[PDB]
Enzyme design. Sequence first.
Site, PDB file in Angstrom:
ATOM      1  N   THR A   1       0.829  -1.200   0.000  1.00  0.00           N
ATOM      2  CA  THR A   1       0.000   0.000   0.000  1.00  0.00           C
ATOM      3  C   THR A   1       0.863   1.250   0.000  1.00  0.00           C
ATOM      4  OG1 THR A   1      -1.569   1.314   1.309  1.00  0.00           O
ATOM      5  CG2 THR A   1      -0.201  -0.299   2.527  1.00  0.00           C
TER       6      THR A   1
ATOM      7  N   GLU B   1       0.261   3.717   1.709  1.00  0.00           N
ATOM      8  CA  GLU B   1       0.397   4.184   3.089  1.00  0.00           C
ATOM      9  C   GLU B   1       1.789   3.903   3.639  1.00  0.00           C
ATOM     10  OE1 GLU B   1      -2.128   6.241   2.813  1.00  0.00           O
ATOM     11  OE2 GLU B   1      -2.061   6.166   5.011  1.00  0.00           O
TER      12      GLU B   1
ATOM     13  N   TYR C   1      -1.855   1.051  11.008  1.00  0.00           N
ATOM     14  CA  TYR C   1      -2.073   0.356   9.744  1.00  0.00           C
ATOM     15  C   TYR C   1      -0.810   0.341   8.904  1.00  0.00           C
ATOM     16  CZ  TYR C   1      -3.563  -0.432   4.918  1.00  0.00           C
ATOM     17  OH  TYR C   1      -3.722  -0.952   3.654  1.00  0.00           O
TER      18      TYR C   1
ATOM     19  N   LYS D   1       1.454  -2.946   7.901  1.00  0.00           N
ATOM     20  CA  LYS D   1       1.660  -3.321   6.506  1.00  0.00           C
ATOM     21  C   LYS D   1       3.131  -3.289   6.138  1.00  0.00           C
ATOM     22  CE  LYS D   1      -2.422  -4.129   4.392  1.00  0.00           C
ATOM     23  NZ  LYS D   1      -2.693  -5.270   3.466  1.00  0.00           N
TER      24      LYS D   1
END
Lengths: 351, 355, 351, 351
Positions: B138, B140, B162, B166
Amino acid sequence: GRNVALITGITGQDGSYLAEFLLEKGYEVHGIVRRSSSFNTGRIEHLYKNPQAHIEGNMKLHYGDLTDSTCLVKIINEVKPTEIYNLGAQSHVKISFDLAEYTADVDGVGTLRLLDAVKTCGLINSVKFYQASTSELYGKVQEIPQKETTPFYPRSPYGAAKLYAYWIVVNFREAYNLFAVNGILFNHESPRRGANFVTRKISRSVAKIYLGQLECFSLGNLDAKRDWGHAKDYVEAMWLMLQNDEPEDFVIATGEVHSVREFVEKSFLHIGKTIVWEGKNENEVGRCKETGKVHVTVDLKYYRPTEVDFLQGDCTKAKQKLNWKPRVAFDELVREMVHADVELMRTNPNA
Amino acid sequence: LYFQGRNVALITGITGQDGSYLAEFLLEKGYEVHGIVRRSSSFNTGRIEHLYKNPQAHIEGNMKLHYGDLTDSTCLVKIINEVKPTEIYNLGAQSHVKISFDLAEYTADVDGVGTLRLLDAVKTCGLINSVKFYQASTSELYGKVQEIPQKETTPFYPRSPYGAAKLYAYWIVVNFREAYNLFAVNGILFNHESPRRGANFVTRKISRSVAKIYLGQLECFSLGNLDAKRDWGHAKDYVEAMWLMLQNDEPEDFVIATGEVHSVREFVEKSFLHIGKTIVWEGKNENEVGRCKETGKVHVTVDLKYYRPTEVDFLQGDCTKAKQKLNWKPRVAFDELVREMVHADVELMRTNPNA
Amino acid sequence: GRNVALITGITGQDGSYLAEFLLEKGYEVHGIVRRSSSFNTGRIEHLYKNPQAHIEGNMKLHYGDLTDSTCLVKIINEVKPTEIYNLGAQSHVKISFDLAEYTADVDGVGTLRLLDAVKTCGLINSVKFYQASTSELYGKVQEIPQKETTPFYPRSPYGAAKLYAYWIVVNFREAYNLFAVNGILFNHESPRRGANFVTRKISRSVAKIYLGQLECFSLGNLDAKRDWGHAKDYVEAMWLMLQNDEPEDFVIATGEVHSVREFVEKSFLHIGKTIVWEGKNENEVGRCKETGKVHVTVDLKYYRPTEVDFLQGDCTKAKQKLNWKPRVAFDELVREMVHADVELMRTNPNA
Amino acid sequence: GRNVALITGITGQDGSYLAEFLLEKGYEVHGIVRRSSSFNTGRIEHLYKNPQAHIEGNMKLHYGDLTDSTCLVKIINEVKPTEIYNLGAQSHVKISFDLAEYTADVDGVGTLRLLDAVKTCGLINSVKFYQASTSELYGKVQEIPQKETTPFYPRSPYGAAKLYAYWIVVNFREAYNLFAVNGILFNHESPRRGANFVTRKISRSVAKIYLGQLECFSLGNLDAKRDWGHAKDYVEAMWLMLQNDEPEDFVIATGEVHSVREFVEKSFLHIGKTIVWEGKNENEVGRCKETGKVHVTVDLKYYRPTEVDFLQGDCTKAKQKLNWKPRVAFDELVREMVHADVELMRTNPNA
Ligand SMILES: NC(=O)c1ccc[n+]([C@@H]2O[C@H](COP(=O)([O-])OP(=O)(O)OC[C@H]3O[C@@H](n4cnc5c(N)ncnc54)[C@H](OP(=O)(O)O)[C@@H]3O)[C@@H](O)[C@H]2O)c1
Ligand SMILES: NC(=O)c1ccc[n+]([C@@H]2O[C@H](COP(=O)([O-])OP(=O)(O)OC[C@H]3O[C@@H](n4cnc5c(N)ncnc54)[C@H](OP(=O)(O)O)[C@@H]3O)[C@@H](O)[C@H]2O)c1
Ligand SMILES: NC(=O)c1ccc[n+]([C@@H]2O[C@H](COP(=O)([O-])OP(=O)(O)OC[C@H]3O[C@@H](n4cnc5c(N)ncnc54)[C@H](OP(=O)(O)O)[C@@H]3O)[C@@H](O)[C@H]2O)c1
Ligand SMILES: NC(=O)c1ccc[n+]([C@@H]2O[C@H](COP(=O)([O-])OP(=O)(O)OC[C@H]3O[C@@H](n4cnc5c(N)ncnc54)[C@H](OP(=O)(O)O)[C@@H]3O)[C@@H](O)[C@H]2O)c1
Ligand SMILES: C[C@@H]1O[C@H](OP(=O)(O)OP(=O)(O)OC[C@H]2O[C@@H](n3cnc4c(=O)[nH]c(N)nc43)[C@H](O)[C@@H]2O)[C@@H](O)[C@H](O)[C@@H]1O
Ligand SMILES: C[C@@H]1O[C@H](OP(=O)(O)OP(=O)(O)OC[C@H]2O[C@@H](n3cnc4c(=O)[nH]c(N)nc43)[C@H](O)[C@@H]2O)[C@@H](O)[C@H](O)[C@@H]1O
Ligand SMILES: C[C@@H]1O[C@H](OP(=O)(O)OP(=O)(O)OC[C@H]2O[C@@H](n3cnc4c(=O)[nH]c(N)nc43)[C@H](O)[C@@H]2O)[C@@H](O)[C@H](O)[C@@H]1O
Ligand SMILES: C[C@@H]1O[C@H](OP(=O)(O)OP(=O)(O)OC[C@H]2O[C@@H](n3cnc4c(=O)[nH]c(N)nc43)[C@H](O)[C@@H]2O)[C@@H](O)[C@H](O)[C@@H]1O
Ligand SMILES: Nc1nc2c(ncn2[C@@H]2O[C@H](COP(=O)(O)OP(=O)(O)O)[C@@H](O)[C@H]2O)c(=O)[nH]1
Ligand SMILES: Nc1nc2c(ncn2[C@@H]2O[C@H](COP(=O)(O)OP(=O)(O)O)[C@@H](O)[C@H]2O)c(=O)[nH]1
Ligand SMILES: Nc1nc2c(ncn2[C@@H]2O[C@H](COP(=O)(O)OP(=O)(O)O)[C@@H](O)[C@H]2O)c(=O)[nH]1
Ligand SMILES: Nc1nc2c(ncn2[C@@H]2O[C@H](COP(=O)(O)OP(=O)(O)O)[C@@H](O)[C@H]2O)c(=O)[nH]1
C-alpha cells in the site's frame, strides 16, 4: 439513577433484541462493533435516531474487538457503563471445529480481556457484568434435566471456550467481588437468527421452496433434540439477572424438547406440505406427501464429530428468583420464523 | 494435484472491494477461485453473492468459500492444504487507517502477523515451490513522503498502526522470497475506489453523502482534513495488476497508481457538480464549511473527529516500472471515477434510503 | 518398536524426571525448550552426551514455544514422536492472578495448539498424547476425597486455563479418536521443585537458617492442606497412562493430607529445631523452642484471592488399572528436600 | 527525585548493565521478569539488598510478559516510572527464523503493547520511552557505513519485527507527543552476553579448550563482518538518549569492522594458539599451528538462510549531540571475554 449499558456482540441476534429492550427501559446503550469491509449493523440500523443518515441517538456504537485489550479498556473507560453484557462471540458450534483457536481467543480469552478491562478501569465496584453462557456447556449431558449444578461436559471447541469463560467469570466474582453472572441460556431463535443455525436454515429453506425458488436442501443430524425458545424472551432474563440483589448464575430455558426432524415437519406444515421420511442415515430423505417431491436430504458435512444429542433445561431457579417465564413456545416459534422468512423471500429471491 | 493448466487461486479478503473484483477477473479467465471468509453473525458476502452458481440457493460453482481468519494458524494450513492453490492473493486486512489508531493491536495481528501466518502456512504445507504469493501492500507505506512522486525505491515512512503493520507484512514477504525462494511479490498499490468501496473511506463517504443530499435524505455531512491529496484509481483496473504481477517471469515488487493527484476538496466539488451543485468554501480549519452556490445551503462541514493524529498529506505514485514490465495501464481516470461513484450511489439511495 | 517421546516443559521439575525415566527405557527423548537470555536447562544438562560441551546423545532439544503454532508443527513433523507429554505451562497459581492472559494462552490455548499440530502433521492415529492436568481443577472441592468423577470447581486463572485444556483434550479424543489422556496429578514435589512453591520455599529457607545464611522467612496461608507426593513417582504414572490399552483419565495422588504448618514443623525438625506457633492470622509467627528465635512469619502478599483450602486425591482407579503405587510418603519427602537444599546452600549461599 | 526506571528485559545482558548504571545514579529501578520454572535472575541477583535472602532494595522485580497487556498496565500503574527502557525481546536472529511468530508477537507487537500501556496509564506526557532498536534493521546494507538516514532492509523475522517496533515507536512520538526514541545500536557484547551469540560462543569455547575441557567446536559463517562494542558502554547511550532535550533516534556503534574469523583468531591468540585455516565452505577447519590439532569446524546448521554479511555503524550524530563515545575497543573486548570465561570455566566444567 444512571443506566448505561455496554453490549459486546450488539450486532448479533441477542444484542439487537437486548438493545431494543434496554432502550425501551430508558438506558443509554453502547455497543462494540467489529470493523468490517461492509457494514454489519443491519439488525440495529433501525435504532439510529435517523436511520437514513445513520446518526446516533441513545444507542452509540464503538469499533472494537474482544481480542484487542487496549480498545476494550479505552471504550469501557470512556463509557463508564453500569451494566456490561458480553454477548460477543464466534457463536457457531460447527464452525468452531475448524476455527478452534480463534473461537478460544474470542469466546474464552476475550471474556477474560473484558473482565480485566473492567478491573483496569477501576469499575469492579461500579459494574454489573453479564456473561453469555450456554447450554452447550452441558454437552454430553450429565443430568436430565440440566440445572445450574449439573456438571459440564463440553463437546466442541466452542463449548470448551465458553467453559473457560464461565469459570473465569466465577473467579472474578469470587476473587474481586465483581457482580458477574453466567446466564446459562439454552437455544433461542427468532426471525433474526443466524442463517446457518438449524432452525433459521429450515425456515429460510421452507420459505424459498414455498415460493418456488428452491427445490431441496440438505441437513445433518435429523434426530438431535433441543430446548428452543425465543431470543426476545431470553434477553429480558439477562437484564433480570443483573437486577438481582446477589450475583447468581441461572439456567434459562423452556424445559420442552423437540427434534430437528419435528422442526422440519412443523415448518413444512405451515406452507401446506406434509413431509414423509424415507431411507436411513445419510440416505434419508424428506418428501412432500401431496406432490411427491423430495425437499430434504442429509449431508454428512453438516454433522459434528462430537454431537450434542439432547438438551433440556430446568429453569426452576430463575422462575422462583427472577419471576421469569418463557412467553413463546415451540409451535409459535416455528410459525413466526417460517412466516417471517416467506415475507422476506417475497422481497428478494437472493435473500 | 498440481499440473500445468490447472489454475487455482486462493483469495484472503475475498468479501472486500478488491477481492470481489479480483474474483470476477480470475473466474472469467477460467480459474477455480477459493476465498477465505470470516464467520459473521450476518452474512458478509454481499459483494460476491452474484458469483454463486445459484444465487437464490447460494450454491457454489467455480467460486468456493471457506470459513477462516488470518489470526488462526491451523485454519490457514487446513484451507491451503485442502485447496492446493497455484496463486494466493493476501488481500485480507483491517484496511481502514483512521480505525487503526484505536484498533492498533488488532490491526498489527491481522495485517502484520497474519501475513506471516499465511506465508508460514504455505511453508508448512510444503508448497514453497508450488504457489505464487501476492501481498496487498500500500502507498500508506510511504506515509510522510520522502520523495515526490513515490516509486519502488522511495524509502518508507509509515504514519499509522495500519502503515506500520503493513510495513512488517511487506518485509516478511521479502524475507520468504529471499530466504526460501518463494515467488512472493508486494503490490504497492495507491488508493483505489469503486462503487463497492467501503462506506467510510473518504471517496465513498462523499459519493454516498452527495447522493443522499440530492435525494433529500440528508442536509449536511462532516469531513476531516479537506486538504489531503491522493492518487485515486479504480479497483477494477488495479486487481488486473495483481494478476499480472503473478504472471511475471520473476517475483518483483511494483508500484501501481495513476500518477495524478487530487484533493479531498476537489473530490467533494466534482461530486456535487454531478448533482448540479457548485460548492463554495467559507471559513478555515474546523470552521470551514462548503456551501451550495445556487441555493446558499451549507452541505459540508468539518469535524476534528475525522482527522488522524499523524496525517498522510500527499500521495503520488510513479508506476513507470509496472508500465515497462507488466504493460499495465490505468483505464479509469479521476473524473470518470467520481461520476461513476456518484451515479451508482444515487441509484442505491433512491432504492433504499437506509443504505 | 519406535519409542520417540516429545516433552514440552522438559526443563521443568517433571520434565527432568520424565526424561530420565524414558531414557532408562531406551527411548529417544525430544524436548521443547524456550529461548531464554540465559540457559534454562540446568535440570537436564547432565543428560547431554557430553555435559562439558553440551553435545546431545539420546535427549535432543528444540527451541520452541506453546504460543507459536508454526514452530510446534515444525518440531512435531521433524520428530514424529510416538508419545507426547504436554508438561509445558506457566504452572504457578499465585503468579497466574497477575498473569492471567499469558497463563490462558500457554496453559489453555497452548494445549489446543499442540493437539492441532499433531493433527496437522497427520499423526492423529500415530501418537499417544499425555496432558498435564492437575488437582487445581477441583479448587473448592465438591467431594472429599476427589476422584476422576468429582465435579470440577477452579479457583484461579491457572485452574480455569487447565480446565480448558482438560476438555479440549477430551474433545480431540472423542472427535478424532486421538489417544489422549488427562493425568489429574495432585501436588508433587522434589529437590528440583520450583523455589517459590510452598514446599521448596520451606526446605530452601530451613536450609539457609541452618547454615546461618538466613534468620527468618515469611509464608502466606499456613492452614492450607495438600496431598503431596514425589515427582519421580508421578512421572512413572504418566508413562503408565500411555501404556494403557485404552485412553483413560486418571487421578494420581497419595491420599494423605498435611498442612503447610506441618510441612514447616517437619522441615525444621530435620535441622534439630522445634517450631512453636504463637499468635493468629497475619500476626502468627513460628519460633524455635530451643533458641527462642523467630524463624517464620506471615505476609498476606503470599495469600491467594480465591484460596484452594483442601486437596486429597483418591487414586483407586490408577491403582487397579495401572498397578501404580507411590513409594515416597510425606515424611520422607520432607527429609529428602531439606537434606538436598542444605547441601546445595552449603556450596552456594546465593542459591 | 523523581527518578524511577522500568526496564523490560532486565534479566538480559543489557538490562543487567543498565540496572547497575541507573542504580549508581540513584534511580529506583524496576524490572519486568518472566516467570520461569527456575530462576532467570542470575545477571542481577547481586543487586538484591540481601543476595542470600533475595530481599529487594532499590531494584524491584515484577513478574510479567510483553505479550500480556493487562500485566503491563498493572505494573506501569503501580510503578509510575519516569523512564521506560524496552529491552525485552527474543533477541536471537537465527532462532527467529523457526520462531518467527513468537518473535513478531514479542519484539513487534510487544512494543506496541508497552506503548499502549503507557497511554492507557495516562503517562503519555510524563514518561520517556527508550526502544531497543538494532543494526539488524540495515540487514542487506544499502550504504557503508550505516547511519540514521541509511534505508532499512531487514533480513530475518527478528529484523522485520524490530522494524515494526521502530516505526510504531515513531508513530507514538509523532501522534501523541510521547518522548520516545529508537536506539539503533550495533552489536554489543560482554562477559554476560548470551552463550549462543557468536562472540560469547567463541570465548566460552576457547576458554574450555585452554582448560582442557573441550577439544573442538563448530561455527557457521566465518566471514560475516560486524561492528562490535561493549554492552557496558552502550547502556550509557540509552540513558543519554532520554536525557536529550528532544526525542531523537540515534545510531550507536564503534565504526570498526571485524570478521567472525578474526574473533576466532584473536581469541585463540589469547590462550597461546595460532589458528591456521584449511578447506572451503562447510569443509573449512581451523587448526592450531603450534600443535596441529583441529579446534574449529563449520556446520551449515549455524548458517542463516538470509545472512547479514556486513555491518559498520556511523554514530556521528550521537557523538555530536549526546557526547557519547565508545570506551572498549575490539582487541580489549576479545581479551576481556576470553579471560572472564577462563575464570568462569575454571569453577565449573559444565558451565
Ligand atoms: N443463540 C443461542 O441459542 C445461544 C445460547 C447460549 C448462548 N449463546 C451466546 O449468546 C451470545 C449471543 O448469541 P447470538 O445468537 O446473538 O450470537 P450471534 O448472532 O452470532 O452474535 C454474535 C455477536 O458477537 C460478535 N462478535 C464475534 N466475534 C467478535 C469479536 N472477536 N470481537 C467482538 N465482537 C465479536 C458478532 O459480531 P459480527 O456481527 O461482526 O459477527 C455478533 O455481534 C453469543 O455469545 C452466543 O455464543 C447463544
Ligand atoms: N483500497 C485501497 O485503496 C488499498 C490501497 C492499497 C492497499 N490496500 C489493501 O488491499 C487489500 C484490499 O483492499 P480492500 O479495499 O479490498 O479492503 P476491504 O474492502 O476492507 O476488504 C478487506 C477484506 O479483508 C477481510 N478481513 C479483515 N480482517 C480479516 C481477518 N482477521 N481474517 C481474514 N480476513 C479478514 C475483510 O473481511 P470482512 O468483509 O469480514 O470485514 C474483507 O474481506 C487490503 O489488504 C487493503 O489493506 C487497499
Ligand atoms: N508439580 C505439581 O504439583 C503439578 C500438579 C499437577 C499438574 N502440574 C502441571 O504439570 C506440568 C509440570 O509440572 P512442573 O512442576 O514440572 O512445572 P514447572 O517446573 O513449572 O515446568 C514448567 C515447564 O513448562 C515450560 N514452559 C512454560 N511456559 C512455556 C511456553 N510458553 N512454551 C513452552 N514451554 C513453556 C517451562 O519452561 P521454562 O523452564 O523456560 O520456564 C518448564 O519447562 C505443568 O503443566 C504443571 O502445570 C504440576
Ligand atoms: N546485544 C546486541 O548486540 C543488540 C543490538 C541491538 C539491539 N539489541 C536488542 O537490545 C535488547 C537487549 O539486548 P540483550 O543482548 O540484553 O538481549 P538478551 O540478553 O537476549 O535479553 C533479552 C531480555 O528480554 C527478555 N524477554 C524475552 N522475551 C520476553 C517476553 N516475551 N516478555 C518479557 N521479557 C522478555 C529476556 O528475558 P529471559 O531472561 O526471561 O529470556 C531478557 O531479559 C533486546 O531487545 C535485543 O534485541 C541487542
Ligand atoms: C461460505 C458459505 O458457507 C455456507 O455454508 P453454511 O454457513 O454452513 O450454511 P448452510 O447450512 O450451507 O446454509 C444455511 C442457509 O444460509 C444461506 N446462505 C449460505 N450462504 C449464503 C450467502 O452467501 N448469502 C446469503 N444471503 N445466504 C447464504 C443458505 O441459503 C441457507 O438458507 C454455504 O451454504 C455457502 O455456499 C458458502 O460456502
Ligand atoms: C459504528 C458507526 O461508525 C460510523 O462512523 P464511521 O465508520 O467513521 O463512518 P462516517 O464517516 O461517520 O460515515 C460514512 C458513511 O457510513 C455510513 N454509515 C455509518 N454507519 C452506518 C451503518 O450503520 N449502516 C450503513 N448502511 N451505513 C452507515 C454513513 O451514512 C456515511 O455515508 C458512524 O457514522 C455511525 O453512526 C456508527 O457509529
Ligand atoms: C521477582 C522475584 O520474586 C520473588 O518472589 P516469589 O517468586 O514469589 O518467591 P518468594 O516466595 O518470595 O521466595 C521463595 C524462594 O525463592 C527464592 N528466590 C526469590 N528470588 C530469587 C532469585 O532471584 N534467585 C534465586 N536463586 N532465588 C530466589 C527465595 O530465596 C525463596 O527461597 C521475590 O522473593 C524476589 O525478591 C523477586 O521479587
Ligand atoms: C537447546 C540447546 O541448543 C544449543 O544450540 P545453540 O543455542 O544454537 O548454541 P550453540 O551455538 O550450539 O553453542 C553455544 C555455546 O552454548 C553452550 N550450550 C549449549 N547448550 C547449553 C546448555 O544446555 N547449558 C549450558 N550451560 N551451555 C550450553 C555451548 O557449550 C556453546 O559454548 C545446543 O548446543 C544444545 O546441544 C541444545 O540443543
Ligand atoms: N447448524 C446446523 N445444525 C444442524 C443441521 N442439521 C442438524 N443439525 C443439528 O441441530 C442441532 C442444533 O444445531 P445449531 O442450530 O447449530 O445450534 P447448536 O445447538 O448450538 O449446535 C445440532 O445438534 C445440529 O447437529 C444443519 O444443517 N445445520
Ligand atoms: N475516511 C475518511 N477520510 C477523510 C475524511 N475527511 C478527510 N479525509 C482524508 O482523506 C484521505 C484519504 O482517507 P481514506 O479514504 O480513509 O484513505 P487512506 O488514504 O487510506 O487514508 C486521508 O488523508 C483522510 O485524512 C473522512 O471523513 N473520512
Ligand atoms: N507458593 C506459596 N504457597 C503458599 C505460601 N504460603 C502458603 N501457601 C499455600 O500452600 C498451598 C500450596 O501452594 P503451592 O506450593 O504454590 O502449590 P498449589 O497447590 O499449586 O497452589 C497453597 O494453598 C498456598 O496458598 C507461600 O509463601 N508460597
Ligand atoms: N550465533 C551464531 N552466529 C554465527 C555463528 N557462526 C557465524 N555466525 C555469524 O556471526 C554473525 C553475528 O551473529 P550473532 O552473534 O548471533 O549476532 P547477530 O548480528 O544478531 O546475528 C552472524 O553473521 C552469524 O551468521 C554461530 O555459530 N552462532
